[PDB]
Amino acid sequence: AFRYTRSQSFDIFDINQKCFVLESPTQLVALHLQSQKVRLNIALYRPRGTGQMPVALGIKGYKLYMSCVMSGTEPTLQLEEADVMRDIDSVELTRFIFYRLDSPTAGTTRFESAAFPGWFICTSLQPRQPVGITNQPDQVNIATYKLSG
């Protein structure tokens, strides 16, 4: 279903200027720096014939990737010490795949889970909380980011 084409590093902030920081291998938080700002190593993929650009999201320098998985009976965002996958050819591996959705005019971006369509990478309105996923993006959370390579 997806083949690795390349990786590229990006700076990232959410729409309220919170950036990501890695507090442990299991906790990524969004806060105002004003400590270690995280860059994403975004692996981009090509499909073949819910979004426009399939990517994996690496926490640069830490060899960790974002994945969406069921935990209990609820979708959950998590970080996995997972290898760079050349071929995403199983439902299982699609957990790592997000659609990067860019707004042409505004240059903002959202990330929708491929494994959990309708689910979006989000931050709390409050700082110092973990990043998460939601099926109500930008509704009492922020699911909107600004990226720069």
XYZ file of N, CA, C and O in Angstrom:
596
model
N 0.825 -1.256 0.000
C 0.000 0.000 0.000
C 0.850 1.294 0.000
O 0.544 2.204 -0.757
N 1.896 1.370 0.835
C 2.789 2.554 0.872
C 4.268 2.197 0.775
O 4.750 1.292 1.456
N 4.990 2.964 -0.035
C 6.425 2.825 -0.151
C 7.192 4.107 0.267
O 6.836 5.212 -0.120
N 8.250 3.928 1.050
C 9.098 5.018 1.515
C 9.752 5.714 0.343
O 10.378 5.050 -0.497
N 9.631 7.044 0.287
C 10.345 7.787 -0.757
C 11.513 8.599 -0.192
O 12.623 8.540 -0.752
N 11.299 9.313 0.915
C 12.401 10.018 1.594
C 11.978 10.492 2.968
O 10.817 10.352 3.349
N 12.937 11.032 3.711
C 12.681 11.678 4.998
C 13.177 13.106 4.991
O 14.166 13.415 4.350
N 12.505 13.959 5.751
C 12.917 15.352 5.873
C 12.575 15.914 7.253
O 11.526 15.618 7.823
N 13.494 16.712 7.782
C 13.344 17.281 9.109
C 12.553 18.581 9.065
O 12.719 19.398 8.144
N 11.723 18.761 10.087
C 10.827 19.883 10.167
C 10.783 20.413 11.577
O 10.792 19.653 12.542
N 10.742 21.730 11.685
C 10.337 22.375 12.925
C 8.823 22.425 12.927
O 8.201 22.446 11.881
N 8.250 22.442 14.119
C 6.799 22.425 14.292
C 6.339 23.162 15.565
O 6.947 23.081 16.624
N 5.248 23.900 15.413
C 4.576 24.597 16.500
C 3.094 24.388 16.245
O 2.676 24.312 15.084
N 2.280 24.299 17.290
C 0.827 24.328 17.078
C 0.321 25.761 16.928
O 1.078 26.710 17.122
N -0.955 25.919 16.593
C -1.471 27.246 16.247
C -1.400 28.251 17.412
O -1.473 29.452 17.191
N -1.252 27.773 18.638
C -1.053 28.661 19.761
C 0.404 28.763 20.189
O 0.684 29.069 21.343
N 1.320 28.535 19.254
C 2.776 28.607 19.487
C 3.359 27.623 20.501
O 4.451 27.840 20.999
N 2.672 26.528 20.785
C 3.246 25.514 21.650
C 4.076 24.615 20.761
O 3.668 24.305 19.665
N 5.261 24.231 21.225
C 6.101 23.320 20.493
C 6.155 22.018 21.279
O 5.695 21.954 22.422
N 6.701 20.980 20.644
C 6.751 19.654 21.240
C 8.032 19.504 22.049
O 9.079 19.978 21.631
N 7.958 18.836 23.197
C 9.162 18.423 23.913
C 8.999 16.981 24.399
O 7.911 16.584 24.805
N 10.088 16.214 24.338
C 10.081 14.798 24.688
C 10.498 14.667 26.135
O 11.638 14.953 26.459
N 9.578 14.263 27.003
C 9.854 14.233 28.434
C 10.383 12.871 28.866
O 11.143 12.758 29.829
N 9.994 11.845 28.118
C 10.469 10.495 28.302
C 10.177 9.755 26.994
O 9.397 10.246 26.164
N 10.723 8.540 26.825
C 10.381 7.780 25.619
C 8.904 7.460 25.468
O 8.516 6.945 24.441
N 8.096 7.718 26.487
C 6.668 7.493 26.390
C 5.818 8.763 26.564
O 4.618 8.674 26.648
N 6.423 9.941 26.622
C 5.654 11.180 26.825
C 6.209 12.367 26.060
O 7.293 12.879 26.369
N 5.435 12.780 25.058
C 5.684 13.954 24.263
C 4.655 14.987 24.688
O 3.452 14.702 24.669
N 5.112 16.185 25.040
C 4.201 17.230 25.493
C 4.293 18.443 24.595
O 5.258 18.610 23.821
N 3.295 19.303 24.713
C 3.263 20.508 23.922
C 3.292 21.642 24.935
O 2.470 21.675 25.864
N 4.268 22.531 24.800
C 4.344 23.672 25.695
C 4.934 24.901 25.048
O 5.521 24.848 23.963
N 4.761 26.017 25.737
C 5.401 27.256 25.344
C 6.810 27.241 25.911
O 6.991 27.123 27.128
N 7.805 27.348 25.043
C 9.180 27.501 25.489
C 9.447 29.012 25.576
O 9.273 29.743 24.590
N 9.818 29.460 26.782
C 9.803 30.885 27.158
C 10.320 31.090 28.587
O 10.957 30.210 29.175
N 14.757 24.122 27.812
C 14.276 22.775 27.509
C 14.195 22.524 26.001
O 14.192 23.466 25.196
N 14.079 21.243 25.648
C 14.437 20.735 24.312
C 13.269 20.634 23.315
O 12.447 19.710 23.390
N 13.233 21.578 22.371
C 12.245 21.574 21.307
C 12.538 20.430 20.330
O 13.666 20.274 19.858
N 11.505 19.646 20.044
C 11.575 18.501 19.145
C 11.366 18.940 17.700
O 10.456 19.727 17.411
N 12.193 18.409 16.796
C 11.926 18.486 15.378
C 11.341 17.148 14.962
O 11.639 16.121 15.557
N 10.497 17.167 13.945
C 10.006 15.936 13.361
C 10.888 15.542 12.200
O 11.351 16.391 11.422
N 11.153 14.240 12.117
C 11.719 13.657 10.929
C 10.558 12.965 10.247
O 10.107 11.913 10.673
N 10.041 13.612 9.217
C 8.829 13.180 8.559
C 9.227 12.312 7.368
O 9.888 12.785 6.423
N 8.847 11.039 7.417
C 9.144 10.134 6.314
C 7.970 10.237 5.369
O 6.833 10.038 5.770
N 8.183 10.591 4.118
C 7.024 10.601 3.261
C 6.988 9.400 2.342
O 8.005 8.823 2.011
N 5.761 8.996 2.048
C 5.439 7.773 1.358
C 4.597 8.075 0.113
O 4.014 9.155 -0.025
N 4.553 7.089 -0.776
C 3.746 7.097 -1.992
C 2.809 5.909 -1.879
O 3.265 4.838 -1.547
N 1.510 6.094 -2.169
C 0.589 4.972 -2.283
C 0.647 4.358 -3.675
O 1.625 4.562 -4.405
N -0.382 3.595 -4.035
C -0.765 3.470 -5.445
C -2.290 3.630 -5.615
O -3.029 3.739 -4.630
N -2.753 3.677 -6.862
C -4.119 4.097 -7.161
C -5.172 3.146 -6.643
O -6.115 2.830 -7.358
N -8.219 9.247 3.009
C -8.766 10.403 3.720
C -7.814 11.623 3.703
O -7.999 12.578 4.468
N -6.823 11.607 2.809
C -5.809 12.672 2.774
C -4.918 12.715 1.546
O -5.141 11.977 0.584
N -3.894 13.574 1.600
C -3.117 13.957 0.407
C -1.640 13.527 0.402
O -1.070 13.300 -0.672
N -1.011 13.446 1.572
C 0.383 13.035 1.643
C 0.610 12.096 2.824
O 0.641 12.558 3.963
N 0.744 10.772 2.565
C 1.026 9.837 3.649
C 2.464 9.932 4.171
O 3.425 9.917 3.390
N 2.584 10.055 5.492
C 3.851 10.271 6.181
C 3.911 9.396 7.426
O 2.864 8.989 7.936
N 5.139 9.087 7.873
C 5.423 8.654 9.238
C 6.094 9.822 9.994
O 6.799 10.645 9.404
N 5.846 9.919 11.295
C 6.323 11.058 12.083
C 7.331 10.626 13.143
O 6.976 10.054 14.182
N 8.599 10.895 12.857
C 9.700 10.539 13.737
C 10.048 11.714 14.635
O 9.949 12.870 14.222
N 10.416 11.399 15.874
C 10.836 12.370 16.861
C 12.333 12.438 16.675
O 13.062 11.512 17.034
N 12.786 13.519 16.059
C 14.122 13.539 15.512
C 15.151 13.451 16.614
O 15.057 14.133 17.646
N 16.126 12.575 16.386
C 17.187 12.312 17.349
C 16.913 11.211 18.347
O 17.818 10.806 19.066
N 15.674 10.730 18.396
C 15.244 9.799 19.439
C 14.770 8.433 18.916
O 14.477 7.525 19.705
N 14.710 8.278 17.593
C 14.436 6.970 16.962
C 13.047 6.457 17.324
O 12.782 5.266 17.335
N 12.148 7.381 17.588
C 10.797 7.053 17.957
C 9.867 7.570 16.883
O 10.128 8.635 16.295
N 8.780 6.834 16.651
C 7.762 7.209 15.682
C 6.389 7.243 16.337
O 6.105 6.450 17.227
N 5.558 8.195 15.909
C 4.159 8.257 16.332
C 3.352 7.151 15.665
O 3.531 6.848 14.495
N 2.506 6.508 16.454
C 1.568 5.522 15.960
C 0.218 5.697 16.667
O 0.153 6.198 17.788
N -0.853 5.292 15.994
C -2.168 5.300 16.575
C -2.598 3.877 16.746
O -2.589 3.112 15.782
N -2.960 3.515 17.973
C -3.371 2.145 18.248
C -4.553 2.123 19.185
O -4.781 3.072 19.920
N -5.318 1.044 19.147
C -6.376 0.853 20.120
C -5.745 0.532 21.450
O -4.900 -0.344 21.542
N -6.175 1.231 22.481
C -5.794 0.910 23.846
C -7.035 0.880 24.734
O -7.704 1.877 24.917
N -7.312 -0.299 25.272
C -8.613 -0.636 25.802
C -9.551 -0.732 24.630
O -9.377 -1.586 23.729
N -10.540 0.148 24.645
C -11.514 0.234 23.587
C -11.446 1.605 22.914
O -12.373 1.969 22.220
N -10.351 2.343 23.118
C -10.208 3.700 22.583
C -8.906 3.970 21.817
O -7.828 3.563 22.238
N -9.013 4.667 20.678
C -7.800 5.024 19.956
C -6.855 5.825 20.845
O -7.306 6.627 21.659
N -5.560 5.603 20.673
C -4.543 6.233 21.496
C -3.373 6.579 20.612
O -3.049 5.823 19.717
N -2.742 7.724 20.872
C -1.489 8.072 20.205
C -0.386 7.506 21.032
O -0.384 7.646 22.245
N 0.579 6.873 20.410
C 1.750 6.526 21.192
C 3.036 6.590 20.404
O 3.025 6.758 19.189
N 4.142 6.480 21.130
C 5.468 6.493 20.554
C 6.028 5.081 20.615
O 5.930 4.422 21.630
N 6.597 4.615 19.512
C 7.132 3.261 19.437
C 8.546 3.337 18.941
O 8.794 4.026 17.959
N 9.462 2.634 19.601
C 10.845 2.509 19.114
C 10.847 1.590 17.906
O 11.340 0.465 17.972
N 10.305 2.091 16.805
C 10.017 1.286 15.656
C 10.985 1.640 14.547
O 11.462 2.774 14.461
N 11.280 0.651 13.707
C 12.277 0.810 12.654
C 11.663 1.603 11.520
O 10.441 1.707 11.436
N 12.510 2.175 10.664
C 12.029 2.929 9.518
C 11.547 1.870 8.543
O 12.317 0.979 8.148
N 10.267 1.957 8.193
C 9.603 0.919 7.437
C 9.683 1.339 5.957
O 9.140 2.372 5.579
N 10.381 0.555 5.131
C 10.421 0.795 3.691
C 9.082 0.504 3.013
O 8.663 1.246 2.125
N 8.420 -0.570 3.434
C 7.113 -0.916 2.903
C 6.094 -1.003 4.017
O 6.285 -1.743 4.983
N 5.031 -0.218 3.887
C 3.847 -0.341 4.731
C 2.821 -1.123 3.930
O 2.089 -0.558 3.140
N 2.808 -2.437 4.126
C 1.997 -3.340 3.321
C 1.054 -4.185 4.170
O 0.612 -5.248 3.737
N 0.733 -3.711 5.367
C -0.161 -4.433 6.257
C -0.972 -3.435 7.026
O -0.540 -2.307 7.223
N -2.145 -3.869 7.479
C -2.998 -3.044 8.322
C -2.217 -2.649 9.597
O -2.227 -1.496 10.027
N -1.518 -3.621 10.155
C -0.743 -3.467 11.366
C 0.224 -2.273 11.272
O 0.307 -1.476 12.203
N 0.926 -2.155 10.142
C 1.948 -1.119 9.947
C 1.389 0.253 9.615
O 2.078 1.270 9.734
N 0.142 0.265 9.170
C -0.573 1.489 8.906
C -0.786 2.326 10.169
O -1.116 3.495 10.069
N -0.588 1.743 11.352
C -0.617 2.534 12.573
C 0.331 3.747 12.552
O 0.043 4.757 13.158
N 1.454 3.629 11.843
C 2.481 4.686 11.761
C 2.176 5.773 10.750
O 2.861 6.781 10.731
N 1.193 5.539 9.882
C 0.925 6.394 8.751
C -0.121 7.436 9.097
O -1.212 7.088 9.575
N 0.252 8.704 8.857
C -0.614 9.874 8.975
C -0.726 10.543 7.619
O 0.217 10.531 6.840
N -1.904 11.070 7.311
C -2.039 11.981 6.190
C -1.746 13.403 6.659
O -2.399 13.930 7.563
N -0.740 13.986 6.027
C -0.380 15.365 6.195
C -1.289 16.219 5.310
O -1.282 16.114 4.080
N -2.087 17.051 5.950
C -3.082 17.833 5.236
C -2.679 19.300 5.334
O -2.685 19.871 6.410
N -2.291 19.874 4.209
C -1.791 21.240 4.155
C -2.853 22.171 3.587
O -3.560 21.808 2.657
N -2.972 23.353 4.187
C -3.856 24.394 3.711
C -3.012 25.312 2.870
O -2.069 25.929 3.377
N -3.346 25.416 1.577
C -2.490 26.176 0.661
C -2.264 27.628 1.138
O -1.115 28.043 1.393
N -3.370 28.359 1.290
C -3.356 29.776 1.652
C -2.612 30.025 2.959
O -1.683 30.840 3.017
N -3.029 29.287 3.988
C -2.662 29.556 5.360
C -1.371 28.861 5.773
O -0.784 29.201 6.789
N -0.930 27.878 4.996
C 0.308 27.151 5.313
C 0.258 26.469 6.672
O 1.262 26.338 7.357
N -0.935 26.067 7.080
C -1.102 25.312 8.296
C -1.252 23.874 7.845
O -1.392 23.596 6.667
N -1.235 22.973 8.808
C -1.174 21.565 8.551
C -1.938 20.819 9.628
O -1.865 21.165 10.808
N -2.661 19.789 9.224
C -3.185 18.825 10.186
C -2.673 17.433 9.827
O -2.266 17.184 8.678
N -2.680 16.539 10.811
C -2.234 15.147 10.601
C -3.342 14.161 10.971
O -3.660 14.025 12.159
N -3.907 13.472 9.970
C -4.976 12.511 10.183
C -4.439 11.080 10.184
O -3.698 10.711 9.300
N -4.803 10.274 11.171
C -4.382 8.881 11.211
C -4.946 8.103 10.009
O -6.155 8.183 9.686
N -4.081 7.333 9.363
C -4.526 6.407 8.318
C -5.180 5.145 8.938
O -6.120 4.593 8.387
N -4.689 4.709 10.084
C -5.261 3.555 10.746
C -6.616 3.915 11.367
O -7.534 3.062 11.409
N -6.765 5.183 11.797
C -7.996 5.651 12.458
C -8.562 6.878 11.750
O -8.525 7.980 12.294
N -9.087 6.690 10.531
C -9.622 7.802 9.770
C -10.616 8.589 10.606
O -11.361 7.985 11.378
N -10.599 9.915 10.440
C -11.383 10.846 11.265
C -10.693 11.227 12.571
O -11.220 12.067 13.313
N -9.528 10.618 12.860
C -8.721 10.963 14.044
C -7.496 11.801 13.678
O -6.834 11.525 12.672
N -7.251 12.832 14.503
C -6.243 13.867 14.256
C -5.282 14.057 15.448
O -5.677 14.012 16.606
N -4.005 14.243 15.137
C -3.012 14.596 16.146
C -3.333 15.971 16.734
O -3.465 16.970 16.004
N -3.449 16.019 18.050
C -3.905 17.217 18.731
C -3.115 17.540 20.004
O -2.476 16.671 20.602
N -3.163 18.808 20.398
C -2.662 19.238 21.671
C -3.790 19.794 22.532
O -4.836 20.212 22.042
N -3.562 19.773 23.836
C -4.444 20.430 24.774
C -4.365 21.966 24.629
O -3.333 22.534 24.225
N -5.479 22.628 24.931
C -5.495 24.071 25.101
C -4.510 24.446 26.206
O -3.862 25.468 26.147
N -4.387 23.590 27.207
C -3.456 23.830 28.290
C -2.075 23.322 27.908
O -1.948 22.232 27.353
N -1.031 24.093 28.232
C 0.338 23.625 28.054
C 0.789 22.573 29.059
O 0.179 22.393 30.111
N 1.887 21.915 28.711
C 2.504 20.851 29.495
C 1.690 19.564 29.558
O 1.976 18.720 30.387
N 0.702 19.398 28.678
C -0.024 18.134 28.579
C 0.505 17.275 27.436
O 1.043 17.794 26.477
N 0.334 15.941 27.530
C 0.774 15.139 26.398
C -0.009 15.437 25.128
O -1.207 15.759 25.185
N 0.673 15.324 23.994
C 0.021 15.268 22.688
C -0.925 14.074 22.673
O -0.692 13.087 23.385
N -2.001 14.170 21.894
C -2.973 13.058 21.764
C -3.620 12.988 20.389
O -3.142 13.622 19.452
N -4.673 12.180 20.269
C -5.520 12.155 19.078
C -6.969 12.404 19.431
O -7.385 12.171 20.566
N -7.735 12.874 18.447
C -9.130 13.265 18.680
C -9.901 13.078 17.407
O -9.337 13.214 16.339
N -11.193 12.790 17.523
C -12.093 12.806 16.365
C -12.962 14.067 16.311
O -13.917 14.140 15.522
N -12.607 15.043 17.155
C -13.150 16.413 17.180
C -12.001 17.439 17.085
O -11.799 18.255 17.977
N -11.240 17.401 15.993
C -10.074 18.258 15.859
C -10.421 19.730 16.002
O -11.443 20.151 15.474
N -9.577 20.488 16.713
C -9.743 21.939 16.885
C -10.980 22.322 17.708
O -11.296 23.517 17.825
N -11.631 21.300 18.304
C -12.770 21.489 19.217
C -12.362 21.184 20.666
O -12.358 20.048 21.116
N -12.023 22.243 21.385
C -11.520 22.179 22.751
C -10.154 21.489 22.823
O -9.786 20.860 23.840
N -9.397 21.654 21.735
C -8.013 21.172 21.568
C -7.500 21.846 20.312
O -8.272 22.530 19.619
N -6.225 21.641 19.988
C -5.641 22.230 18.798
C -5.137 21.096 17.948
O -4.327 20.327 18.406
N -5.597 21.017 16.707
C -5.172 19.984 15.767
C -4.532 20.604 14.538
O -4.477 19.971 13.478
N -4.051 21.843 14.705
C -3.548 22.691 13.626
C -2.129 23.176 13.955
O -1.866 23.745 15.032
N -1.234 22.968 12.998
C 0.208 23.186 13.189
C 0.794 24.041 12.089
O 0.214 24.174 11.036
N 1.963 24.600 12.374
C 2.797 25.244 11.376
C 4.141 24.523 11.292
O 4.821 24.361 12.294
N 4.487 24.065 10.090
C 5.747 23.349 9.837
C 6.710 24.231 9.033
O 6.289 24.976 8.147
N 7.997 24.138 9.337
C 9.031 24.663 8.441
C 10.217 23.705 8.389
O 10.750 23.336 9.430
N 10.623 23.290 7.185
C 11.819 22.445 7.030
C 13.069 23.171 7.494
O 13.259 24.336 7.142
